[PDB]
């Protein structure tokens, strides 16, 4: 009675610098970034319990500032110039598990090599009714 399991959810992002000769005209974006929602390496895939993920972006991305991803991978790739707090809202398959908001501070590459680098990861434990 009142049984639960804990599962790890990791929100992270990677990015790469885009040199000027590879930038779209009148896009001020200096980077290509990707935010991901994954599980720990030591646990089963989160697709077993995650229904869908909403990514809330900074208003500069309007009218495309709310992006729904229903199937894995729960990845979102965009170009940009600025770091901002990404709100990731995780929805679970089992209705008994309420949605959670995770705020991930987007971290952009500063090596400027044009290679992809790891930016940041935000780790939370969630509770799943059993």
């Amino acid at each position: 009675s009142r049984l639960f399991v804990k599962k790890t959810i990791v929100v992270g992002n990677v990015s790469k610098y885009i040199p000027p000769d590879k930038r779209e005209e009148n896009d001020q974006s200096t980077h290509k970034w990707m935010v991901y929602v994954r599980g720990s390496r030591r646990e089963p895939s989160i697709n077993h319990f995650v229904k869908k993920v909403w990514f809330f972006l900074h208003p500069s991305y309007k009218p495309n500032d709310l992006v729904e991803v229903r199937e894995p991978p729960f990845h979102l790739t965009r170009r940009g110039w600025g770091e901002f707090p990404v709100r990731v809202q995780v929805h679970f398959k089992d209705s008994q598990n309420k949605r959670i908001d995770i705020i991930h501070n987007l971290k952009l590459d500063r090596t400027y090599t044009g290679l992809q680098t790891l930016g940041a990861e935000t780790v939370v434990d969630v509770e799943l009714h059993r």
Binding site: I102, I103, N105, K107, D109, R110, T111, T117, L118, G119, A120, E121, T122, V123, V124
Partner: peptide, 8 residues
Amino acid sequence: AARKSAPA
């Protein structure tokens, strides 16, 4: 949440 970030 437990945050970790690369300096560069």
